[PDB]
Write a protein that binds this ligand. Sequence first.
Ligand SMILES: *[C@@H]1O[C@H](CO)[C@@H](O[C@@H]2O[C@H](CO)[C@@H](O[C@@H]3O[C@H](CO)[C@@H](O)[C@H](O[C@H]4O[C@H](CO)[C@@H](O)[C@H](O)[C@@H]4O)[C@@H]3O)[C@H](O)[C@H]2NC(C)=O)[C@H](O)[C@H]1NC(C)=O
Ligand SMILES: *[C@@H]1O[C@H](CO)[C@@H](O[C@@H]2O[C@H](CO)[C@@H](O[C@@H]3O[C@H](CO[C@H]4O[C@H](CO)[C@@H](O)[C@H](O)[C@@H]4O)[C@@H](O)[C@H](O)[C@@H]3O)[C@H](O)[C@H]2NC(C)=O)[C@H](O)[C@H]1NC(C)=O
Ligand SMILES: *[C@@H]1O[C@H](CO)[C@@H](O[C@@H]2O[C@H](CO)[C@@H](O[C@@H]3O[C@H](CO[C@H]4O[C@H](CO)[C@@H](O)[C@H](O)[C@@H]4O)[C@@H](O)[C@H](O)[C@@H]3O)[C@H](O)[C@H]2NC(C)=O)[C@H](O)[C@H]1NC(C)=O
Ligand SMILES: *[C@@H]1O[C@H](CO)[C@@H](O[C@@H]2O[C@H](CO)[C@@H](O[C@@H]3O[C@H](CO)[C@@H](O)[C@H](O)[C@@H]3O)[C@H](O)[C@H]2NC(C)=O)[C@H](O)[C@H]1NC(C)=O
Ligand SMILES: *[C@@H]1O[C@H](CO)[C@@H](O[C@@H]2O[C@H](CO)[C@@H](O[C@@H]3O[C@H](CO)[C@@H](O)[C@H](O)[C@@H]3O)[C@H](O)[C@H]2NC(C)=O)[C@H](O)[C@H]1NC(C)=O
Ligand SMILES: *[C@@H]1O[C@H](CO)[C@@H](O[C@@H]2O[C@H](CO)[C@@H](O[C@@H]3O[C@H](CO)[C@@H](O)[C@H](O)[C@@H]3O)[C@H](O)[C@H]2NC(C)=O)[C@H](O)[C@H]1NC(C)=O
Ligand SMILES: *[C@@H]1O[C@H](CO)[C@@H](O[C@@H]2O[C@H](CO)[C@@H](O[C@@H]3O[C@H](CO)[C@@H](O)[C@H](O)[C@@H]3O)[C@H](O)[C@H]2NC(C)=O)[C@H](O)[C@H]1NC(C)=O
Ligand SMILES: *[C@@H]1O[C@H](CO)[C@@H](O[C@@H]2O[C@H](CO)[C@@H](O[C@@H]3O[C@H](CO)[C@@H](O)[C@H](O)[C@@H]3O)[C@H](O)[C@H]2NC(C)=O)[C@H](O)[C@H]1NC(C)=O
Ligand SMILES: *[C@@H]1O[C@H](CO)[C@@H](O[C@@H]2O[C@H](CO)[C@@H](O[C@@H]3O[C@H](CO)[C@@H](O)[C@H](O)[C@@H]3O)[C@H](O)[C@H]2NC(C)=O)[C@H](O)[C@H]1NC(C)=O
Ligand SMILES: *[C@@H]1O[C@H](CO)[C@@H](O[C@@H]2O[C@H](CO[C@@H]3O[C@H](CO)[C@@H](O)[C@H](O)[C@@H]3O)[C@@H](O)[C@H](O)[C@H]2NC(C)=O)[C@H](O)[C@H]1NC(C)=O
Ligand SMILES: *[C@@H]1O[C@H](CO)[C@@H](O[C@@H]2O[C@H](CO)[C@@H](O)[C@H](O)[C@H]2NC(C)=O)[C@H](O)[C@H]1NC(C)=O
Ligand SMILES: *[C@@H]1O[C@H](CO)[C@@H](O[C@@H]2O[C@H](CO)[C@@H](O)[C@H](O)[C@H]2NC(C)=O)[C@H](O)[C@H]1NC(C)=O
Ligand SMILES: *[C@@H]1O[C@H](CO)[C@@H](O)[C@H](O)[C@H]1NC(C)=O
Ligand SMILES: *[C@@H]1O[C@H](CO)[C@@H](O)[C@H](O)[C@H]1NC(C)=O
Ligand SMILES: *[C@@H]1O[C@H](CO)[C@@H](O)[C@H](O)[C@H]1NC(C)=O
Ligand SMILES: *[C@@H]1O[C@H](CO)[C@@H](O)[C@H](O)[C@H]1NC(C)=O
Lengths: 235, 232, 603
Amino acid sequence: IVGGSNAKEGAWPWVVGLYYGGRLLCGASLVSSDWLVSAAACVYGRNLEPSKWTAILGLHMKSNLTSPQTVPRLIDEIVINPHYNRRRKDNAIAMMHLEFKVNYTDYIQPICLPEENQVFPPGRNCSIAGWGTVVYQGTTANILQEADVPLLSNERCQQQMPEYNITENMICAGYEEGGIDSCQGDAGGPLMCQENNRWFLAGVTSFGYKCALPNRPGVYARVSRFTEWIQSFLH
Amino acid sequence: APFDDDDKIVGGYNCEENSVPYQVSLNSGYHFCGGSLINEQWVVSAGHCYKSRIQVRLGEHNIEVLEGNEQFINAAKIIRHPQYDRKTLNNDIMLIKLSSRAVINARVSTISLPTAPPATGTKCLISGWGNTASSGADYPDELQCLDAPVLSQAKCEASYPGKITSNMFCVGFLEGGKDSCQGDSGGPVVCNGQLQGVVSWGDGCAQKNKPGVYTKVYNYVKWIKNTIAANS
Amino acid sequence: IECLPGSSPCTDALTCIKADLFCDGEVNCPDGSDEDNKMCATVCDGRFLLTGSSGSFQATHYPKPSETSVVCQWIIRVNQGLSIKLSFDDFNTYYTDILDIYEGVGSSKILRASIWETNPGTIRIFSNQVTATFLIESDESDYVGFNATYTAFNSSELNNYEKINCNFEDGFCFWVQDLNDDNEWERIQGSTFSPFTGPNFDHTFGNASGFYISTPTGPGGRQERVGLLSLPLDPTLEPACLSFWYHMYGENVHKLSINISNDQNMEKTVFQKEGNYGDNWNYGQVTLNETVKFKVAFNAFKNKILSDIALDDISLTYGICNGSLYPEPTLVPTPPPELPTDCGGPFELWEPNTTFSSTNFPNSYPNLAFCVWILNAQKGKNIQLHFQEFDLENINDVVEIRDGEEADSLLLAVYTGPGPVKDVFSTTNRMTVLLITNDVLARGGFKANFTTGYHLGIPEPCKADHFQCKNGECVPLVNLCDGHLHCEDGSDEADCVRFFNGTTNNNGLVRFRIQSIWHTACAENWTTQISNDVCQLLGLGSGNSSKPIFPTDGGPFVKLNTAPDGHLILTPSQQCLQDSLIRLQCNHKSCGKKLAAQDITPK
Ligand SMILES: *[C@@H]1O[C@H](CO)[C@@H](O[C@@H]2O[C@H](CO)[C@@H](O[C@@H]3O[C@H](CO)[C@@H](O)[C@H](O[C@H]4O[C@H](CO)[C@@H](O)[C@H](O)[C@@H]4O)[C@@H]3O)[C@H](O)[C@H]2NC(C)=O)[C@H](O)[C@H]1NC(C)=O
Ligand SMILES: *[C@@H]1O[C@H](CO)[C@@H](O[C@@H]2O[C@H](CO)[C@@H](O[C@@H]3O[C@H](CO[C@H]4O[C@H](CO)[C@@H](O)[C@H](O)[C@@H]4O)[C@@H](O)[C@H](O)[C@@H]3O)[C@H](O)[C@H]2NC(C)=O)[C@H](O)[C@H]1NC(C)=O
Ligand SMILES: *[C@@H]1O[C@H](CO)[C@@H](O[C@@H]2O[C@H](CO)[C@@H](O[C@@H]3O[C@H](CO[C@H]4O[C@H](CO)[C@@H](O)[C@H](O)[C@@H]4O)[C@@H](O)[C@H](O)[C@@H]3O)[C@H](O)[C@H]2NC(C)=O)[C@H](O)[C@H]1NC(C)=O
Ligand SMILES: *[C@@H]1O[C@H](CO)[C@@H](O[C@@H]2O[C@H](CO)[C@@H](O[C@@H]3O[C@H](CO)[C@@H](O)[C@H](O)[C@@H]3O)[C@H](O)[C@H]2NC(C)=O)[C@H](O)[C@H]1NC(C)=O
Ligand SMILES: *[C@@H]1O[C@H](CO)[C@@H](O[C@@H]2O[C@H](CO)[C@@H](O[C@@H]3O[C@H](CO)[C@@H](O)[C@H](O)[C@@H]3O)[C@H](O)[C@H]2NC(C)=O)[C@H](O)[C@H]1NC(C)=O
Ligand SMILES: *[C@@H]1O[C@H](CO)[C@@H](O[C@@H]2O[C@H](CO)[C@@H](O[C@@H]3O[C@H](CO)[C@@H](O)[C@H](O)[C@@H]3O)[C@H](O)[C@H]2NC(C)=O)[C@H](O)[C@H]1NC(C)=O
Ligand SMILES: *[C@@H]1O[C@H](CO)[C@@H](O[C@@H]2O[C@H](CO)[C@@H](O[C@@H]3O[C@H](CO)[C@@H](O)[C@H](O)[C@@H]3O)[C@H](O)[C@H]2NC(C)=O)[C@H](O)[C@H]1NC(C)=O
Ligand SMILES: *[C@@H]1O[C@H](CO)[C@@H](O[C@@H]2O[C@H](CO)[C@@H](O[C@@H]3O[C@H](CO)[C@@H](O)[C@H](O)[C@@H]3O)[C@H](O)[C@H]2NC(C)=O)[C@H](O)[C@H]1NC(C)=O
Ligand SMILES: *[C@@H]1O[C@H](CO)[C@@H](O[C@@H]2O[C@H](CO)[C@@H](O[C@@H]3O[C@H](CO)[C@@H](O)[C@H](O)[C@@H]3O)[C@H](O)[C@H]2NC(C)=O)[C@H](O)[C@H]1NC(C)=O
Ligand SMILES: *[C@@H]1O[C@H](CO)[C@@H](O[C@@H]2O[C@H](CO[C@@H]3O[C@H](CO)[C@@H](O)[C@H](O)[C@@H]3O)[C@@H](O)[C@H](O)[C@H]2NC(C)=O)[C@H](O)[C@H]1NC(C)=O
Ligand SMILES: *[C@@H]1O[C@H](CO)[C@@H](O[C@@H]2O[C@H](CO)[C@@H](O)[C@H](O)[C@H]2NC(C)=O)[C@H](O)[C@H]1NC(C)=O
Ligand SMILES: *[C@@H]1O[C@H](CO)[C@@H](O[C@@H]2O[C@H](CO)[C@@H](O)[C@H](O)[C@H]2NC(C)=O)[C@H](O)[C@H]1NC(C)=O
Ligand SMILES: *[C@@H]1O[C@H](CO)[C@@H](O)[C@H](O)[C@H]1NC(C)=O
Ligand SMILES: *[C@@H]1O[C@H](CO)[C@@H](O)[C@H](O)[C@H]1NC(C)=O
Ligand SMILES: *[C@@H]1O[C@H](CO)[C@@H](O)[C@H](O)[C@H]1NC(C)=O
Ligand SMILES: *[C@@H]1O[C@H](CO)[C@@H](O)[C@H](O)[C@H]1NC(C)=O
């Protein structure tokens, strides 16, 4: 996918991995003590059997699931946003309920949701996370990657990718010359923006056209307008 | 009425199919056949895959990129089944002895031999570098998998009359489309954690309503044990 | 004189040369002892050089089967400009045994032939030097031994008939395999690997007892080019006709061509066929030109596995080619992609129409199908799908059920995989059923019920003004924000404490509800415990103390009673005077503040 870098231990405590059938299929974020926020597209068609989903909290390396800092958990309830379409790829955000609960620790922390009428200005650098690949396809990296990419306004996003509706329900991040992206390969985590002195769940990894290609913005699911829906299930 | 004769097979990319220590590959300058590892020196592979020079790769994940976790042991002796029939592709099983003992780790290990014959409808897993692509020629270099329950004997016999015996069984209920681009040869067939057979042949790359044929190794367990005892 | 590893000294021990140079046909030692027959003691027959016109040799263990791996090499030398023809009657072995015929001697050899477990037939080498390398790669009892009969012939006085005609029974005849190809042609008796690809019998003989050439049958996965070359043809005063039989069977057949080449560099193609032509031997007819010396070739492009192309029964005649009695070959019909697009089928149905197959549920459903079912019911009536039978693929095939009557449809449930599935209840009087299919593994399908009615999924409300939770359990007063687990949904334990007229999101006045009425609270004394209790009730993080502003409200205030267990006790008894509004202040829970000392990478 190009653009990844090394991630320190505990750098992203709210990034968790989702395993279905023994393989890392998608990613999620830790918001509360019993709920996760993940992409609805990658969990579609597998919500009838939540027992087959393995939620790994505090994961740092693909083949090092032995440290005590990582506490595996199961998923019992899976809910998908009713506004999802699967044809326009609109509102690809779904929530997964943990088995019982998770104890807060240094390497496992929640992430604050955006408040009402809180929009991150475009052009502000934000971090991305996920267990993506170095090349466009294949050769999955065993170490969590991190990169900084400024937000792209939807006005130019709808023109740079004249294939979707985009509308106001998506947030685009990318570069004019490309190089840094997280849309394809594997989500493995959401889009995080930090203002004041704390990160926020600004976006969730979504579909895309190409990785490390110029004039190919990376689409991310907008969470500012979905704060109420998430908070309805958080408590 | 021009045509192109192309299709695709269901996606089975997985997470590069890791945590599969019983999967091995046979190399003679390129990947041609697969196989399974049964002990520290013997492997199970299809009889038709016999070649003068074969290199056995242990725990391989990419056929073109070396990640440093692959064991390369050259083949020392290859024994084919004495009752192999090339015309009918019956008794399509052979054993290859590694020159040096394998190193057992998280990526290389052995799978226990089956003790009971497979049953109809039993869930099975097939591992191999299959040809999965959206369109065109985009053959991947990563290990893949695909579930395949065992079908009934009568249906298997009726599917290919004159070419099916008691040592063969169908792949599964999967139609498989019209890909017609085979990419699996000698791939392990594991049912309930036991190697019930290997990939032998089929009518194309699992053409619609015509599944492939796998060589059952339950009847060959005694032959494998005798071969191991005679060439320990 | 000491020699480095990988090299061996000569008999005189004066010069060190490569180990492979010994007994290879190249004289490198000063005394010429490297080619001595006694020095090259192969033990097979005691001889190494065969300078005679004709002869034969034996292998190790002549009277008894061999039991030890022995390497033997033989070199035959004849007059310059003459070729050697190797003829074999019947050869068998224990798999691992290759004669390893090579072109010439020394380091210039590449490969000539390699036949194991089968009779090679007849092998012709167009050189004055022929080399063989007997090898054993097994410790078992292999074959007794190997012999070869050869005879010298001029090979340049041959006419066009002998050069061209070859039915593939006496080996490859005089055809020379190209040395600039990815792989060489293979002559295999009977049927070969890759079922439904390649001939099952020989054309010349009629059954499996015959021999034919074809592309390599190994289960490879790379594109390769194979080629066969012939001797130059002498000029003729009459045009000649070239006849051959080609069998191009397989879904991945790329191209077959002749590509005649001449000494004038005016190469041209006279025959070219592409694609599959069925499991039948087709007749190829070629007219000849280019009286000057030219070579007839058969360039075949080999694709991945299941792309076998075979040739047999090459013959030559004279005169203009007659009318081809055999019909011109035609390509296979091929499964036609007749624009699957979207079948559509039924779209809307009403109450009289309830039972319906998906598309062809008894048999299967078509691939690439996007079927839309519009379930319309009367006003005020809900719709219950009540699936009867459901058999999809697993994760690819999905049945999507949404709520209609609006542009922004609301997803209700997603069903996939085998086995029965639960019923679906729609919010309004319209349900949309979507079937997304894939191009592979199309199961039988699904069948619905289309049940409609009033309050299909809504339980009967409780009487006597009793509150009801989501699970339907009756909760009159017991679990009205009292902190219990009567209903697993938790709706009966909804937050009865909230802010009112505050400055920000985490700010507000006192507002506590006991059962169904919101009211203020008494906080004349304030400590850390009550602040923590308020924070816990509001679901916030750690908080601190707060102070009132002015007693602007004199309504029915309710005192707050704390407990050592953290539970808040509400006493509806205003035993106080001059009540004042109290501001509730708390902070949010600890979020993902960065702690690791992340480095800086300006890249
Ligand atoms: C018989 O085999 C020979 C050797 O394999 C083969 O000769 C090769 O032919 C190809 C194409 O016929 C040549 O490739 C060409 O190279 C030139 C110069 O680089 C290009 O301009 C060509 O591009 C165009 O070629 C055609 C016009 O001539 C166009 O119709 C076409 O659409 C392309 O746009 C092409 O790439 C190659 O150089 C030779 N190799 C040699 C001469 O060594 C020959 O074609 C075969 N068939 C015969 C003789 O019938
Ligand atoms: C080569 O392939 C040809 C297929 O196209 C075969 O037929 C003829 O071959 C020649 C030369 O290769 C072609 O070129 C023409 O030949 C004519 C012949 O002229 C004759 O008639 C005139 C007038 O009566 C007379 O003056 C001449 O002496 C000849 O008797 C020339 O006149 C042309 O200029 C041109 O060079 C022909 O086109 C071609 N077809 C025919 C119908 O002639 C040929 O047999 C092949 N060569 C072999 C097999 O050696
Ligand atoms: C759901 O069940 C329905 C059962 O009532 C199915 O209705 C069937 O529809 C077909 C096709 O329309 C009918 O076959 C013909 O229908 C025409 C309709 O005539 C129309 O035009 C005249 C013009 O004067 C008008 O007066 C009528 O009111 C109609 O608007 C008839 O004229 C023919 O004689 C013939 O009957 C069936 O009769 C009808 N009923 C049954 C029992 O088949 C409906 O098709 C089902 N839904 C789906 C998707 O198939
Ligand atoms: C995750 O958090 C929960 C909640 O704090 C932890 O449960 C609590 O664990 C402590 C220490 O193990 C318990 O205290 C001890 O309990 C035993 C009885 O098991 C008692 O005999 C001791 O005198 C002492 O009180 C505590 O009871 C228990 N429950 C609560 C409600 O606090 C849990 O241990 C944490 N897990 C991890 C892995 O950190
Ligand atoms: C947001 O991120 C972008 C990168 O994605 C930042 O742009 C970077 O800005 C620095 C300046 O501090 C550039 O460094 C420059 O490098 C040249 C190399 O010769 C050097 O001569 C200059 O003196 C300077 O050090 C860096 O190249 C540039 N990145 C790219 C890709 O061009 C941007 O500053 C970030 N903004 C915020 C607010 O974090
Ligand atoms: C193998 O057979 C070939 C015949 O294809 C022999 O080649 C032929 O050798 C004769 C010599 O006896 C050549 O005749 C001479 O040709 C030259 C022109 O190069 C001419 O000036 C002389 O007056 C004489 O006629 C003949 O051209 C040559 N080629 C053919 C096609 O006949 C070859 O010598 C034989 N090799 C042996 C017997 O080792
Ligand atoms: C094309 O078909 C013919 C006929 O099968 C093949 O051989 C031809 O055989 C006849 C018989 O010896 C040759 O003599 C001809 O006989 C007929 C009938 O008696 C007579 O009417 C003619 O005047 C002539 O004498 C004939 O020359 C010979 N060739 C042809 C063209 O008829 C021939 O081999 C087949 N192939 C080719 C490429 O011609
Ligand atoms: C979904 O469709 C199935 C059939 O396609 C419906 O099953 C049928 O349901 C009716 C009642 O609505 C049954 O009739 C009653 O059966 C009971 C015995 O179970 C009998 O005691 C009553 O006197 C009456 O005859 C009918 O037998 C049953 N048929 C089958 C084959 O199960 C089902 O009701 C539909 N679901 C709905 C409408 O919610
Ligand atoms: C006590 O609860 C109230 C409820 O909001 C808060 O008191 C005041 O909060 C403001 C925040 O805008 C504080 O201003 C700044 O606070 C930071 C620490 O967060 C401090 O480093 C700055 O120098 C500045 O003062 C204000 O100090 C604070 N006042 C008091 C008396 O607390 C706050 O949430 C709670 N106070 C504490 C210390 O947690
Ligand atoms: C399979 O193909 C072979 C190819 O050789 C067929 O062999 C044919 O055999 C007949 C037999 O005629 C006679 O058979 C005598 C032995 O019983 C033998 O001593 C005698 O010399 C003579 O050959 C022969 O006429 C044909 O010429 C042979 N075919 C060829 C192409 O030469 C055989 O019949 C085919 N079928 C089977 C079932 O093997
Ligand atoms: C997203 O889809 C909507 C669908 O309604 C598009 O709305 C179109 O708006 C124009 C402007 O008036 C109308 O002329 C069209 O008729 C509308 N579409 C339809 C289907 O009615 C909207 O433009 C789309 N957004 C983008 C960025 O393409
Ligand atoms: C909001 O940003 C400020 C940036 O200064 C954060 O850090 C404060 O820094 C000052 C330095 O003068 C310290 O005295 C304060 O104690 C720091 N914390 C606070 C709360 O004042 C500040 O932390 C950020 N807000 C949050 C979420 O703490
Ligand atoms: C990897 O696992 C080992 C287990 O021994 C542990 O010591 C180490 O800290 C782990 N590393 C990371 C980055 O989690
Ligand atoms: C090799 O030996 C076998 C058995 O004697 C014999 O049939 C065959 O003729 C010999 N080789 C050749 C050149 O035929
Ligand atoms: C909101 O403001 C009014 C103004 O009098 C006050 O009386 C009331 O108490 C305020 N809020 C609460 C929580 O009571
Ligand atoms: C604060 O006032 C309430 C009002 O009844 C009382 O219950 C509580 O005990 C008081 N707290 C003290 C006296 O510490």
